[PDB]
Structures are given as C-alpha cells and as structure tokens.
Amino acid sequence: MRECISIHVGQAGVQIGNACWELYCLEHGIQPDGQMPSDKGGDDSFNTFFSETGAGKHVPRAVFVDLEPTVIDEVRTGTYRQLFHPEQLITGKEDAANNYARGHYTIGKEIIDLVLDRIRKLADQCTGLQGFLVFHSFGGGTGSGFTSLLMERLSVDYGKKSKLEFSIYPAPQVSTAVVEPYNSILTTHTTLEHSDCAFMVDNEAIYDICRRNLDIERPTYTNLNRLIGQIVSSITASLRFDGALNVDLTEFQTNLVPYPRIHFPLATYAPVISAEKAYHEQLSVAEITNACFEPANQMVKCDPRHGKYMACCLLYRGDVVPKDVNAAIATIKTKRTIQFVDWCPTGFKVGINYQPPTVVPGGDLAKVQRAVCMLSNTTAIAEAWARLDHKFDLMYAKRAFVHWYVGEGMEEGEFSEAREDMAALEKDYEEVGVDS
Amino acid sequence: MREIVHLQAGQCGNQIGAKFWEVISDEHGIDPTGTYHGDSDLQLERINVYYNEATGGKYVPRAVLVDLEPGTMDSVRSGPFGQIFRPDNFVFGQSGAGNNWAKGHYTEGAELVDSVLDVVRKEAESCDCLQGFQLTHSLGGGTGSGMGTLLISKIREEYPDRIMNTFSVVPSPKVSDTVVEPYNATLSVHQLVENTDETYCIDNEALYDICFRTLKLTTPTYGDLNHLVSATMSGVTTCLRFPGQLNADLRKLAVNMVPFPRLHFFMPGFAPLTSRGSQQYRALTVPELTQQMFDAKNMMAACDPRHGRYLTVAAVFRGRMSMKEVDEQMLNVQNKNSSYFVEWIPNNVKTAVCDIPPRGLKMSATFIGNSTAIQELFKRISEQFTAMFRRKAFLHWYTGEGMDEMEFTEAESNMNDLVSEYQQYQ
Ligand SMILES: Nc1nc2c(ncn2[C@@H]2O[C@H](COP(=O)(O)OP(=O)(O)OP(=O)(O)O)[C@@H](O)[C@H]2O)c(=O)[nH]1
Ligand SMILES: Nc1nc2c(ncn2[C@@H]2O[C@H](COP(=O)(O)OP(=O)(O)O)[C@@H](O)[C@H]2O)c(=O)[nH]1
Ligand SMILES: [Mg+2]
C-alpha cells in the first residue's frame, strides 16, 4: 500500500544507493539473492521498498541512472547483481563532463524517455504511492543537469505526488571541481519550483562528524554514505513498523513547511558514536535530543545560532517513552540560545517508533537502544547560499568558462536569471525571520 | 564505449609511441605475442579503449604509425613488442622531410596524407563511441612538425566535436637539436592554437634534470626518458579504463582546465619518482605524494611555476586512498601559497581518484598544470625567430618550397597574441 520510489542519479546518487539498499535488505532480512529464508507469510513491513515476485524473489523499487557506464557496471557485477532487475540500471555512454548544459540540453535528452518509461512501470505496481525519493549531487553535470530535466518532466506526470530531494550541496571550502559554482546556481530553479521538500547535506560537515564522533582518521565515501542511509531509514520507519505515534510523509510535510517557497530543512541524526565510546555513556532520551541542537552536529556547514527556528520534527526510535520526551522538549524551550520565531508558538512535531535501529556488520556505528532523527526548518540556512553566490559572482564577472556552456546550447541569459532567482529566495528567508 | 585512436608522427613520435604501447600492455597484461595472460578479470573489462579484438584471443593496438622515411619504424619493428602492430597501419614515404617544415607540410607530406586518412577512417569508424584522437610528435622536426599539424588540421574537419590531444616535445631552452628549429616550432604552434583542445608541453631538457636529480641515473637512454612520458600518458586516461571513487575522462578535465579557448597549454608531471638507495627512506603517504607532485623540479616542462600564477590544476590519484585526505591536501596547498593562484577562480584544483595503481606500486598521481609561466616558453622562441627572420637566414629553403613570406609574419602575430593573452592574468 504505502510505497516509495527511489531515484539515484549520477555517481553520488548511485553510490549512495549502494549504501541505502544494503541497509534495507539487512533491516528486513532479505539476502543479496533477494530470498527471504524466514518465509517458513504475514509480514508486510518490506512492502514500502520491495515488491514480491511469485518465485519468492523480492525486487527493489529503485531506478539507477547515469550517463557513464563505469559506476553502474560495478553494481551489475558485485554482490548485489542478482538483487536488482536488469532494466532498472539505466546507463548511457558519455558523462555530461561536469557541464550542466550537456546533462540538460544534449546528452540528457537521449536517455530520458527510457527513465520515464521505467518510472511508469514502478508507479503502476504501486497502489498507494507516498512519493518519490530523489538522490543527486549539485556539483555534477548529470546530478545537476539531468535531474533538472527529470524533475521538470515528473512534475507534469505526477503533479500531486510529493517529491523529496536529498542532495549533496557544495562545501564552503573543500571542492572537487572548478565549475562547481555554475552548476549549483543553475540547479536552484528545480529545487525551488519542483521539489516539495529538499534536504541538503555537504561532505565537509560529515567528514567532521566521522572524525570527532566515530574516531575515524581517514573516512572515504563509504563511511559518509552509511550516515545518509540511517537518516532515510528513520524518516521511513513510521511507514514500516509499529509505533505509538506514527508520522506519514504527508503529515511530516504539513508540520515543517510554513509557506510553499520555504521548504529547506536541515537534517541531523543522533547518536553517532563508536562502540568504544558507547561504553562510557548512557544514551538517554534527554541526552540525545541535546545533541541534535548542537551546531557541531549539523549536516550543513551553517550555524543555527545565527538564525531562527520555524519548526522542528523529532523522530525517535526504540526504547523511548513519552514521559521523557516531554521532559526533554521542555528543557530545550528554556534555553535562550535556541530562538523560535514568535509567530510559531508550538514548534515541535513528535514521532515515536518501537523498532530500534539496525546496524550493518563491519560498520562504524555502535549497536544502540534508541536514536533520534531531527528535521528542522531554520532561517540559518540562508548563510550557506550567500557564501556560494560569492563564488559565482567572482567567476562570472569575467565570463571565466561560459563558452563551454553556450557551445552546448545554453544561452547566457540563464546565468543572470538563475543568480537573480537565488537572490530573491535569500531575501525571502531573511524577512520571514522578522518578529511581528 | 570511449575508444581512443592513437597517432604517431615522425622519429620522436614513433620512439615515444613504441614505449607507450609497451607500458600499457604491461598494465593490461598483454604478451609480446598479443595474447592475454593477466591474473585479474578487471584487466579485460575496458581493454576495448585501446585495442581491437581479433580471433583467437589476440588484441591489436588501435594505432597508426606514420613516417616520411621508414628508417625509424624498422628499428621499432625489430624491438620486442614491435610485432603487435597491424602491418597495414604502417604508412611510409620514401624521401625524408629534411627537418624542413615546408617539405613536411606542403610537398612531401601532402602526397602521403591520403594513405594516412584511409587508415584513420577505417579505425575511427569501427568505434562504437569514439572519444577522440591522440597525437605524439615533436615541433622541432620535419615530419612531426610539418605533417603532424597537417594531419591535425584535416581530421578536425572530418570530426569537429571529438577531443584532440597532442603530446608534443618542444625545443629546449639552451641546447638545440636542429639549426632551423625555431622556424619549425613557430610555424607549428600557429597550427596548434587553432586546432587542438589540449596540448602537453614535454621538454627533453627537463627530463634530463629529472633523470639526474631525482632518479640518480648515470647512463639514462631515451628508453628511460620515453618511459617517463608514457607514465604521464597512461595516467591521464586511467579513469576511462578502471573503476574509481571519482571518475574523470579527458573531456571532464578539459572543461575544468581551459577557461578561455586559447589557454590550453599544460605542463605534465608524475609521482612518485625515487632512486634505488632512497627507496628505504620514504614514508609512502598521500602528503608525501602531493609534496613531490607540486615540486617545480618534477615538472616535465622547462617552465617554472614560481614565475607565474596557476589558472587551474588537475591531480589524477591512482590507488585506494581516503577522499578526505586528498580533499584536505588540495585545499591546504591553495591556502598557504595564495600568491601563486589567480584571484578570480575560487577553487583551482580538479581531483579524480581511481582504484588501480600501476603494478608493483602502492599509490600514484599525475599532475596537469595550466600556468601563466608557459608564456616563458613561447617568448624565448619568439625572440629567436625574430633574430633569424630579420636577416632571412634560412628562408630560401622554405620559399623554395613555395611558401609565402606573409605566413611567417602571421605566425609571429598569432604567437605574440598568445603570450599577451597569458600575460594579462599574471
Ligand atoms: N557524499 C558523497 N558525495 C559524492 C559521492 N560521489 C561523488 N560525490 C560528490 O559528487 C560531486 C562530483 O559530481 P558527481 O556526482 O560525481 O557527478 P555526476 O552526477 O556523476 O555527473 P558527471 O560529473 O557529469 O559525471 C562532488 O561534490 C563529490 O564529492 C559519494 O559517494 N558520496
Ligand atoms: N624525448 C624524446 N625526444 C626525442 C626522441 N627522439 C628524438 N627526439 C627529439 O625530437 C627532435 C627530433 O625530432 P625529428 O627527428 O626531427 O622528428 P622528424 O620531424 O620526424 O624528423 C629533437 O629535439 C630530438 O632531440 C625520443 O625518443 N625521445
Ligand atoms: Mg560522473
């Protein structure tokens, strides 16, 4: 009944996919063959992410899309090669090459009808589709440009359905490409107009948590992507397990987005800890909530003390009881460091779910009795954009790469157009924070 | 899916190209017979990039070998791997160019073009999705300089949208190999600026410096120098042919490297390089790898970065390493050395990490630098050209081939604009 469709775009999307679907298989007891041995029926919990074949083989409701065959071919060949349906792993021949115009205007149009055709088949299998979960990077040509095209098309075919959007935003300082500002700014329109709720994370924040909370000196993408998977598991837990106070995706959106234009929450997850440190701490309900409001534990390099909270969604898992959630929230409301906007006097949505977190073998996290995932809509996010407008204005003042984009069938008026869209959005975020 | 066609022009082109095919056959595990003996199933997954398949499990290079006189190619065929090349891909004249760019460009080489273009069509049209073309040559010569630029100008009309890369040896700052060297080099650069997407400026006199100062070799032969160049050549393509955590093909690099369409001359480098004795004193780490990669002594070009500003940089790391440590190191170098990077590009370095190091080595990197210091190369050539041309010292060898003297003044003006184009960003 309550299905979700996952869409994994580009190298970042595909490689996050590997971490997500490893987790979901283990969380439901599905082997990498797709067999469940515990069917000695009456378990529906898998049905959000998997569909059952009459042979007893469970097939992900996923689509993986890339304009290059290198990242997908590993999936076609590794441990999970039997899990995915062969036609869900769509691939092209040549990457957008970090150029948004290739992903959007020239290369993307070659493969888009295959992706849209496959999404029909998955949506027809559903009977109560909650929405689409999209994973991509801002900085890439395929993640930026092809996703831009894809969500504009999905908006026409499925205008009612929620599109949620997890994305890798560029870090403040570390970077991997030089054209990273142009793609990011040009992306903004589709996150502004075609996404119902967008969660941004940047890699420089997550490198920080893996160093001071997991004691890992040299984390790779495999460590980061495992943290992202735990967030998505928690948002969808109330679709999959029993709980005292289950939150649906529709109900989740109603309590975070106060205006249609203002839909950019920060994600945070707690506790993140090594098992060597979990030995010296009690992970009580109060303790884990305080850790969600620390600036050092945010997944974007922005400081919430420089802005105002509009609304917060707290999702708790495991050995948690309402008596202590009430005690924890009451404490937070007393701290003058944490300032809510005056026009939002009841700033919390709470969810409690009985199933505790699973842990992947050989992963970094501890086995824990309980956890909390927090989603928070805050005026402090506007500083992350201003810090990236600067890089765009700096380069663009002298056309530094524009011939690459205009030669691929863009026209240069989009550069100022997109930069003005970002200006308008930043001006809205600063004024909605003003007290009445 | 991303096939490369390899071109070899002239004496230096063939001697380098022969070494390149030995180097990458060792990575893929191809015997001199042309048959596969590699241990890893990952070695054949992308072998299509450089080789065609043949019946019986034999692989042949997608290479075409060109010379105006066969003498050098006979030495190539007498070598150990010289049997792997398809015999129909040797294209040879019967009269040398004489180090005269006009002979190679208008008189001798113009009669040979059609034979080469038939081989290029037949190789290129076999590809499922051609990535582009790759030429090895020298600018100081007659066949490399003259006909190499003729070929480039023709195939870029037949295939405008494909990538065009030149690995080109350029004349060195203080000992010439050829008396007429600066005419050939000046006329040839005038062809490159119009018709190439990337150019890598190798200089033989920098390679002697690396062999002496870093490798401590007492008797380096051109077999050693051509090995260094081939390691650079294979490093740039590795992400097309092995899996990695951040893939990066030729086009992705060019997009991130060339801000304006003329500014496409790059300085290569390779790391690690160590002598036999020092091997025991190293500490194999990404930092130590990064330190040598930016060292001015390690550049394969006779231009010094300290005299200019980097526009853009690429590092293609090979080996299983932590992404955080790489991202950390490339930020750290930019923050300290703020004077050596242009102000108006916020991040100058492109990174790409592959999983498979070369055999017998833990980690490796290939460096590409686009630097305003490259004007130093063209400006010292420009002065020598002017010193000769005002006295018309050797023009009768070129005008007797029907060349027009206006074409010499044109090449000055185009090369002098190019040095001005770089200067404005110093
Ligand atoms: N967190 C995380 N970021 C990743 C991962 N892989 C790539 N990235 C980020 O993605 C960006 C690079 O662009 P890609 O996502 O690789 O690009 P793409 O969507 O494949 O498109 P093309 O560049 O056209 O090939 C950088 O910000 C990387 O740090 C990953 O596994 N995890
Ligand atoms: N690095 C390197 N340089 C070479 C090699 N062979 C020749 N050269 C240089 O390239 C130039 C000679 O090229 P040349 O023989 O004239 O090419 P041609 O046009 O075919 O005649 C000189 O500067 C030589 O020093 C080689 O094997 N390696
Ligand atoms: Mg990619």
Sketch out chain A's domains with CATH numbers.
2-265 (3.40.50.1440), 266-380 (3.30.1330.20), 381-435 (1.10.287.600)
Q: How far is the CA of B65 from the centre of ligand 2 (A)?
A: 15
**B363, two tokens:** 């980690």
From the number of C-beta atoms within 10 Å of its C-beta (0-12, 13-18, 19+), residue B424 rates as exposed
Count of helix runs (H) and strand runs (E) in chain B: 14, 12
How far does Cα A16 stand from its chain's mean position?
10
Please check whether residue A154 is in contact with residue A165, taking contact to mean a CB–CB distance below 8 angstroms: no
- Residue A168, ligand 1, Cβ within 6 A: yes
B128, B244, B252: residue with CB nearest A95: B252
DSSP A145: I
Full DSSP string of B145-180: IIIHHHHHHHHHHH-SSSEEEEEEE---SS--S-TT
Mutate to test the interface with A, among B255, B326, B333 (most CBs of A within 10 A): B255
Residue A379 is assigned to a ligand binding site:
no
Q: Which pair of tokens denotes residue B387?
A: 């010193």
CA distances from B373 to A58, A349, B111, B265, B296 (A): 60, 60, 39, 11, 12
Closest CA to A418 of A405, A431, A433, A404: A405
Pairwise CA distance, residues A337 & A6, whole Å: 38
* Closest among B88, B113, B80 to B9, alpha carbons compared: B113
- Strand (E) or helix (H) holding B185: helix B181-195
**CA-based nearest residue to B59, from B48, B68, B70:** B48
CB atoms within 10 A of CB A320: 23
Burial degree of A8 (CB within 10 A; 0-12, 13-18, 19+):
buried
State if residue A137 touches ligand 1 by the CB under 6 angstroms criterion: yes
Q: Nearest Cβ partner of B323 from A70, A94, A220?
A: A220
Of B157, B110, B91, B187, nearest to B397 by C-alpha is B187
Q: B377-382: long-range contacts at Cβ-Cβ below 8 A with a sequence spacing of 24 or more?
A: B377/B170, B377/B201, B377/B265, B377/B301, B377/B302, B377/B303, B378/B189, B378/B415, B378/B418, B378/B419, B379/B419, B380/B173, B381/B171, B381/B182, B381/B185, B381/B186, B381/B189, B381/B415, B382/B186, B382/B412, B382/B415, B382/B416, B382/B419
Q: What DSSP character marks residue B64?
A: E
Q: Report d(CA A430, CA A65) in Å as an integer.
A: 37
CA–CA distance, A311 with A318 (Å, rounded to integer): 23
Pocket of ligand 2 contains residue B176 by CB under 6 Å: no
Q: Where are the beta strands (DSSP E) in B24-162?
A: 51-54, 58-61, 63-67, 90-92, 130-138
The 3-state DSSP class for residue A84 equals coil
CB contact under 8 A, A177 and B350: yes
- For CA atoms A209, A202, A377, A153, the dihedral sign is negative
Exposed/middle/buried for A141, CB within 10 Å: 0-12, 13-18, 19+? buried
Which residues in chain A are contacts of B128 at CB distance < 8 A? 93
Q: Among B376, B242, B232, B210, which residue's Cα sits nearest to residue B315?
A: B232
E strand intervals along B222-276: 265-271
Eight-class DSSP state of A340: B
Residue B303: Cβ within 10 Å count:
25
* Token pair of A39 as six digits: 């069917």
Phi-psi domain of B402 (left: phi exceeds 0; alpha: psi -120 through 50; beta: other): left
Cβ of B327 and A71 within 8 Å? no
C-alpha dihedral over B9, B10, B12, B18, to 10 degrees? 60
Topology adopted by domain B265-374: 60s Ribosomal Protein L30; Chain: A; (3.30.1330)
> A400 in contact with B at a CB cutoff of 8 Å?
yes
Does A271 sit behind a cis peptide bond, omega within 30 degrees of 0 on the bond before it? yes
Q: Is the dihedral of CA B385, B391, B395, B397 positive or negative?
A: negative
Tokens of B204: 């033989």
Spell out the residues 6+ positions from residue A109 whose beta carbon is closer than 8 angstroms to its own. A149
Q: Count CB-CB contacts under 10 A for residue B129.
A: 10
Q: Do B252 and A97 touch (CB under 8 A)?
A: yes
Calculate the CA dihedral of residues B78, B83, B89, B90 and round it to 10 degrees: 10
- Angstrom distance (rounded) from CA B380 to CA B370: 18
Distance CA B143, CA B69 (A): 9
Nearest-CA neighbor of B10 among B141, B123, B184, B133? Answer: B141
CA distance, residue A318 to nearest chain B CA (Å):
33
Helices then strands, counting H and E runs in chain A, come out as: 17, 12
Phi first, then psi, for residue A6 (nearest 5°) are -105, 135
Dihedral-angle region of residue A409 (phi above 0 means left; psi in -120 to 50 means alpha; beta otherwise):
left
* Spatial separation of the C-alpha atoms in residues B6 and B4, rounded to whole Å: 6
Phi first, then psi: what are they for B135, rounded to 5°?
A: -110, 135
Number of the ligand 1 atom closest to the C-alpha atom of B247: 16
Residues of B in contact with A74 (CB under 8 A): 243
Q: Which of B240, B167, B164, B237 is nearest to B8 (CA)?
A: B167
Say how many C-beta atoms besides its own lie within 10 A of residue B39's C-beta. Answer: 7
Contact call for residues A75 and A51 (beta carbons, < 8 A): no
Distance (Å) from the C-alpha of residue B256 to the closest C-alpha of chain A? 6
Strands A58-60 and A62-66: unpaired
Structure tokens at B78: 């007498």
Q: Which residues does a chain break follow in chain A (C to N more than 2.5 Å)?
A: 40
Cβ within 8 Å of residue A180, ≥6 positions away: A138, A139, A170, A391, B347
Closest listed residue to residue B9, CA positions, set B178, B191, B181, B138: B138
Place of tokens 């299509």: B48
* A118 bridge partner residues: none
A354 part of contact set with chain B, CB < 8 Å: no
What are the tokens at B74? Answer: 């006979």
Write out the H or E segment, with its range, that includes residue A274: none
**Which of B1, B322, B346 lies closest to A391 in CB terms?**
B346
Q: Which atom of ligand 2 is nearest to the CA of B172?
A: 23
List chain B domain ranges: 3-257, 265-374, 375-425
Question: B349-354 and B310-318: which strand pairing?
Answer: parallel
- The CA distance from B143 to A372, in Å, is 71
What does the block give as tokens for A278? 């979990």
Is B42 at the interface with chain A, CB within 8 A? Answer: no
d(CA A410, CA A405): 6
CA distance A104 to A17: 22
How far from chain centre, in Å, is Cα A3? 17
Q: Closest Cα partner for B378 from B193, B178, B122, B239?
A: B193
- For the Cβ of A97 lying below 6 angstroms from any atom of ligand 1, the answer is yes
Closest C-alpha to ligand 2, atom 8: B12
A69-72 contacts, C-beta under 8 A, 24 or more apart: A69/A93, A69/B1, A70/B239, A70/B243, A70/B244, A70/B247, A71/A11, A71/A14, A71/A15, A71/B243, A71/B247, A72/A14
Distance, in Å, from the CA atom of B256 to the CA atom of A181, rounded to the nearest integer, reads: 12
For the residues of B212-227, what is the DSSP string, one character each?
HHTS--SS--HHHHHH
Contact A177 B256 (CB under 8 A): yes
Side chain identity, residue A54: G
**Residues B193-226, buried b or exposed e (16+ Cβ, 10 A)?**
bebbbbbbbbbbebbbebbeebbeeeebeeebbb
Was B364 annotated as part of a binding site?
Answer: no
A180 lines ligand 1 (CB under 6 A): no
The whole-angstrom separation of Cα A62 and Cα B320 is: 29
Contact status, residue A137 vs residue A224, Cβ threshold 8 Å: no
Residue B347 is assigned to a ligand binding site: no
Please list, in sequence order, all residues whose beta carbon lies within 8 angstroms of the beta carbon of residue B293, skipping any fewer than 6 positions away.
Answer: B269, B271, B315, B365, B367
Residue A231 CB coordination number (10 Å):
21
Judge whether B244 is closer than 8 Å to chain A, CB to CB: yes
- d(CA A100, CA A189) in angstroms, rounded, equals 13
Concerning whether A251 is annotated as a catalytic residue, the answer is yes
Phi, psi (deg, nearest 5) at residue A215: 65, 30
B402 shares contact with chain A (CB less than 8 Å): no
Rounded (to 5) percent helix, strand, coil in chain A: 45, 15, 35
The amino acid sitting at A71 is V
Closest CA to A74 of A221, A245, A232, A249: A221
CB A218 within 8 A of CB A331: no
Cβ neighbours of B330 in A, within 8 Å: 174
Q: Are B59 and B135 in contact (CB under 8 A)?
A: no
Spatial contact of A241 and A24, defined as CB atoms under 8 Å apart: no
Query: Ligand 3 centroid to A175 CA: how many Å?
Result: 15
Assign A372 to helix, strand or coil.
strand
User: Hey, what CATH class is B3-257 in?
Assistant: alpha beta
User: Is B243 buried (19+), middle (13-18) or exposed (0-12) by CB count in 10 A?
Assistant: middle
> Residue B210: which H helix or E strand, with range?
helix B204-213
C-alpha to C-alpha distance for B138 and B10, rounded to whole angstroms = 8
Name the strand (E) or helix (H) holding A99: none
Cα Rg, chain B, nearest whole Å? 21
Hey, are the CB atoms on A394 and B344 less than 8 Å from each other?
yes
Q: Are B149 and B24 in contact (CB under 8 A)?
A: no
Between B1, B246, B331, which is nearest A93 by CB?
A: B1
Assess whether the previous peptide bond of A322 is cis (omega < 30° from 0).
Answer: no
Give the CATH superfamily of B375-425: Helix hairpin bin (1.10.287.600)
Which ligand 2 atom is at minimum distance from the Cα of B144? Answer: 19
